[PDB]
């Protein structure tokens, strides 16, 4: 089949610069009757993918001209000339001259923004967790860039590598920032054999760990 | 306004078969092309099959022949995909879409997709998920603001649908994808409020687990 290279995987760009996106393939897309069969595609966070281009360089309906394609035979390329919000998510070529019609395998275009450092929310099992015998305790590190963050949980001291659960959510399209969720579980026992439970966070906005911490104990 | 729509997710045991539909409305269903693409963990779409609805025709994708067979209803307007002897590679997400694309005038028209219907195949048991709330001690953020949270966690298999107050408190909102250990999900979500808000106005939490039929509300208590 036609192997489809996308070329970059991910691109940051700021909103208001230009992005382009390139496609390769390991045949000419020159059909018989001498179109190019090559499409772009647009799959927005938690929704369908959705074609942009098709016929090399045709816009679709209702698609912003901001957009333009171009390329032929085994080269091809997207240009955003203005990115936007809205360009948010994952772009691929399909090729539909060769049968069975191959896909790109994607690239991802996030939005670059100024720096944001982590708010940090760190909860304590719930009673009814508790009374099942499982005890877990919760941090949420809300709206930060870039991405790259990381966390660790120290109980007493001392670091806790077993039982930490982790979940980060897509590049948010309001603020462009990004959120996750560390989740300890540990026995309704042991829990109660320790005192201090301490989510720490290493980001690039902070020369130090940042920290959010809680003492059980009883009163 | 052309509509596809797709099953619900399902939830498959190893080498059995299942049946995808793919309900269409808004075009004359008969005279395009439906086509099935398949997506797996992510970024990585491959190309089914296509079936012209008029006809009957069908053209495979050689590595699905055997495995996809596209069928379609005229009466009801209604396009299938049988899958069958489900194994791993088959968990995926599958979506149908009038690609759009008239063969005789060498040019497209608008293409329309479904919403994706979520196969997944495992012999793990359906188990509903236990709610706890999250009412802050440290994950206060102090005065201002406030976080609360909601933690679903020991359910299987997905999806399970949380929302806040009813779908009312849909802003400052955080739902984390949930994240599969030891053949159970563990989901949370963030609801961030002004201090004025709560505990003064009650903050709930709304989750529902199709598979198992549970559907649970918890408060937000302090
Ligand atoms: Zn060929
Ligand atoms: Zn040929
Ligand atoms: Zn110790
Ligand atoms: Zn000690
Ligand atoms: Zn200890
Ligand atoms: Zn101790
Ligand atoms: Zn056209």
């Known amino acids: 089949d036609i192997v489809m290279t996308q070329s970059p995987l991910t691109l940051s760009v700021t909103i208001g610069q230009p992005a382009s996106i390139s496609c390769k393939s390991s045949?000419?897309?020159?059909?018989?009757?001498?179109?190019?069969?090559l499409n772009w595609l647009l799959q927005r966070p938690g929704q369908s993918p959705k074609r942009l281009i098709h016929?090399?360089?045709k816009l679709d309906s209702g698609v912003p001209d901001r957009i333009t394609g171009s390329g032929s035979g085994t080269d091809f390329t997207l240009k955003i000339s203005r990115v936007e919000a809205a360009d948010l998510g994952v772009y691929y070529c399909v090729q539909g001259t060769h049968f069975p019609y191959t896909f790109g395998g994607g690239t991802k275009l996030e939005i670059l923004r100024g720096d944001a450092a982590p708010t940090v929310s760190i909860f304590p099992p719930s009673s009814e967790q508790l009374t099942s015998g499982g005890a877990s305790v919760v941090c949420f590190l809300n709206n930060f860039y870039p991405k790259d963050i990381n966390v660790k949980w120290k109980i007493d001291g001392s670091e806790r590598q077993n039982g930490v659960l982790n979940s980060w959510t897509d590049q948010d399209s309001k603020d462009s920032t990004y959120s996750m969720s560390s989740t300890l579980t540990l026995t309704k026992d042991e829990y109660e054999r320790h005192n201090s439970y301490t989510c720490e966070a290493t980001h690039k906005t902070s020369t130090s760990p940042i920290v959010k911490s809680f003492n059980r104990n009883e009163c | 306004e052309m509509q596809l729509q797709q099953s619900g997710a399902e939830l498959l045991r190893p080498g059995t078969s299942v049946k995808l539909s793919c309900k269409t409305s808004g075009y004359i269903f008969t005279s395009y092309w439906i086509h099935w693409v398949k997506q797996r963990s992510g970024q990585g779409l491959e190309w089914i099959a296509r079936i012209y609805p008029g006809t009957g025709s069908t053209y495979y994708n050689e590595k699905f022949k055997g495995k996809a067979t596209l069928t379609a209803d005229k009466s009801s307007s209604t396009a299938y995909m049988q899958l069958s002897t489900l194994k791993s590679e088959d968990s995926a997400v599958y979506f149908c879409?009038?690609?759009?694309?008239?063969?005789?005038?060498?040019?497209?028209?608008?293409?329309?997709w479904g919403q994706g219907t979520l196969v997944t195949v495992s012999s793990a048991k359906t188990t509903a998920p236990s709610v706890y709330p999250l009412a802050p001690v440290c994950g206060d953020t102090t005065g201002s603001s406030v976080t609360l949270g909601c933690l679903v966690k020991g359910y299987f298999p997905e999806p399970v649908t949380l929302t806040w107050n009813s779908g009312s408190l849909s802003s400052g909102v955080h739902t984390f994808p949930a994240v599969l250990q030891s053949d159970l999900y563990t989901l949370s979500s963030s609801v961030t409020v002004t201090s004025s808000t709560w505990p003064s106005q009650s903050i709930t939490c709304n989750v529902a687990h199709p598979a198992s039929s549970t559907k649970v509300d918890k408060k937000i208590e302090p």
């Open positions: 016929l090399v360089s």
């Open positions: 045949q000419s897309l020159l059909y018989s009757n001498g179109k190019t069969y």
């Open positions: 879409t009038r690609w759009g694309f008239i063969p005789v005038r060498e040019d497209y028209v608008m293409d329309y």
